[PDB]
Design a protein around this nucleic acid. Structure first.
Ligand code: ZN
Ligand code: ZN
Length: 612
RNA sequence: UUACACGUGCAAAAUCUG
């Protein structure tokens, strides 16, 4: 044929997404005796960068040398991109440094090469050199350096780039705007991200995903879910990257139903084999009270990274299956998956909630010797949690002081919560004091100390701690348990008499306590922390938040149906005993969550073995 | 005049009285 005919065929396949066809035609063209020129090399090199075929890229680079195209800006810039997309920033920089003449694209190719290979600062440094040479940026430049800002978190740098974008007339480019959304979220300004998102003239799925990820990562899970529904309302179809962030919001909200819907979408749309989708699925099921479904997703997973293992390890940890979490960590090492810091936080949390004191000390002490993992403040908080639940409050406080980190509200709150369980009034005062200096607005140290005093019979003291809370304007979030029945969650506080079906819920509670009394249940009043006679103390135990949520569940669901209840507070001992009696009385498996840990009541016992 | 583009999931604690 001709060089034009060969170039047009190669050009078509290189930009269409058929890099091997472009390279096969390159070989046939060379065998044919047709000499490729500067209109062949950029598209053939583009195909190499697409396939990351470094060996062929150097082969074509050799052809460029022999053909005498070393001074061509198009050929050299394609060489920069090829080496950069092949993970060879050194050779990409050597091409860039030796170009006798470059343009914006050659600068963009090198800057994108740095930013795309975990090299965000050398990208910004080259971008700053670009101003000193008076090179006008393009939409590609601003899109690439905004991705570097997002990775580094420099908001003031990105604020300057956003301004430069507007002054350069690129604010309506969908790529540039998508970068601004991701940058602003990753830099801590979710509001500036929403402003760019709202003012956008055109929004792809990347636009909706970057906004939703920014919300779910920032705690606003109700809003990421609302934008997911609004995205479907506008006819935008989520890809395989949208659902992981969406499922992470379902896990935070206990939206077991919602998360089930996404799983059906995942099956229908062929995303079932994606690691991110699988890791988000096991995390969703676990945080929603279904360790069984979480294990099923982990089993069927065709491929697993360290996050998929860490998610299932944290799944067992949160559900009190400490031993099972430790078997998984061993198969991780046998299957050649190195443990991260997130791995050790999860297995240490598993040992804490399951009482594996010996094993918890082993993995913690062996975390840095036998593994490159160095201790974060989260691993020490796990140890304070482990010792606190084992009753070793002296070792817990001594670890807090000797900690190579500055103590926080979590690590002292762990000790304070443990003092509540074991009745250490003195240590409770000390722990509550250190929390108030760290944060004076947290209502937890007040109610905790008020509960500690009231448990000790120090009513006058407890009244003053409650008095001091009301005068400092400290507001506490109501302890409540909710239960999803027919896609409608149902919130219940202790002694709640505001529910529509209150009289049938309470009559059910009366019928239940009748059977519980015959089964041998005797409520103790030492667990009631109110200075009230015995007649109302047993009545107060009867109407706790989860006891209302159970009573509503078994009057609105068929008999024998498993019930799930999510609370924001730890269950007391007598209510843990009462739910054990209820589990066999009603013939159901009742899954109740504390602040984080899950209980499983079945056939008259709980999976925690009365250790939580 | 070719070449250069953006979005990912897994981290320890506490509120039974709002
Ligand atoms: Zn209770
Ligand atoms: Zn239990």
């Amino acid at each position: 044929n001709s060089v034009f005919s060969w170039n047009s065929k190669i050009r078509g396949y290189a930009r269409n997404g058929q890099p091997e066809e472009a390279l096969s035609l390159y070989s046939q063209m060379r065998r044919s005796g047709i000499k490729p020129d500067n209109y062949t090399f950029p598209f053939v090199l583009k195909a190499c960068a697409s396939l990351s075929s470094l060996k062929e890229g150097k082969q074509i680079h050799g052809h460029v040398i022999k053909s005498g195209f070393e001074s061509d800006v198009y050929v050299q810039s394609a060489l920069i991109d090829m080496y950069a997309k092949c993970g060879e920033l050194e050779d990409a920089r050597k091409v860039f440094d030796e170009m006798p003449e470059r343009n914006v694209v050659s600068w963009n190719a090198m800057i994108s090469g740095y930013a795309q290979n975990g090299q965000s600062e050398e990208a910004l440094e080259l971008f700053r050199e670009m101003q000193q040479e008076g090179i006008k940026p393009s939409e590609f430049t601003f899109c690439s350096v905004l991705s570097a800002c997002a990775s580094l978190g420099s908001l003031e740098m990105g604020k300057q780039i956003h301004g430069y974008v507007i002054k350069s007339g690129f604010e309506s480019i969908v790529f540039v705007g998508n970068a601004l959304i991701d940058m602003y979220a990753k830099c801590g300004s979710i509001e500036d991200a929403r402003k760019v998102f709202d003012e956008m003239p055109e929004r792809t799925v990347v636009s909706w995903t970057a906004m939703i990820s920014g919300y779910a990562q920032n705690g606003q899970s109700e809003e990421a879910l609302e934008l997911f529904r609004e995205m479907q309302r506008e006819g935008v179809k989520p890809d395989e990257v949208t659902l992981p962030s969406v499922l992470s919001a379902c896990a935070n909200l206990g939206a077991l139903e919602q998360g089930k819907q996404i799983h059906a979408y995942v099956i229908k749309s062929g995303f079932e084999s994606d690691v991110f989708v699988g890791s988000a699925l096991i995390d969703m099921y676990a945080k929603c009270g279904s360790i069984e479904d979480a294990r099923k997703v982990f089993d069927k997973m065709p491929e697993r990274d360290v996050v998929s293992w860490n998610a299932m390890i944290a799944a067992y940890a949160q559900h009190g299956h400490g031993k099972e979490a430790l078997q998984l960590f061993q198969q991780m090492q046998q299957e050649g998956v190195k443990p991260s810091e997130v791995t050790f936080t999860s297995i240490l949390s598993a040992c804490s909630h399951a009482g594996l004191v010996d094993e918890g000390h082993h993995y913690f002490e062996s975390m840095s010797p036998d593994y490159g993992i160095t201790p974060r403040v989260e691993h020490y908080g796990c140890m304070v949690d482990l010792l606190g639940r084992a009753g070793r409050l002296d070792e817990a406080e001594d670890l807090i002081k000797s900690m190579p980190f500055q103590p926080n509200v979590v690590v002292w709150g762990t000790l304070l919560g443990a003092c509540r369980v074991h009745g250490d009034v003195e240590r409770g005062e000390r722990a509550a004091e250190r929390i108030l200096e760290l944060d004076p607005e947290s209502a937890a140290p007040y109610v905790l100390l008020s509960n500690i005093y009231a448990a000790a019979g120090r009513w006058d003291e407890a009244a003053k701690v409650r008095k001091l809370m009301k005068e400092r304007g400290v507001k506490k979030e109501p302890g409540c348990s909710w239960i999803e029945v027919n896609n409608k969650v149902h919130e219940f506080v202790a002694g709640d008499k505001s529910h529509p079906q209150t009289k049938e819920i309470y009559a059910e509670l009366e019928r239940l306590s009748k059977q519980m009394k015959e089964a041998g249940y005797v409520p103790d009043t030492k667990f009631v922390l109110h200075d009230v006679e015995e007649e109302e103390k047993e009545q107060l135990l009867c109407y706790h938040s989860e006891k209302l949520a159970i009573a509503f569940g078994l009057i609105s669901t068929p008999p024998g149906t498993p019930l799930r209840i999510i609370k924001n507070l730890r269950v007391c001992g007598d209510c843990h005993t009462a739910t054990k009696f209820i589990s066999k009385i009603v013939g159901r498996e009742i899954v109740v969550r504390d602040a984080n840990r899950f209980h499983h009541f079945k056939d008259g016992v709980c999976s925690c073995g009365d250790y939580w």
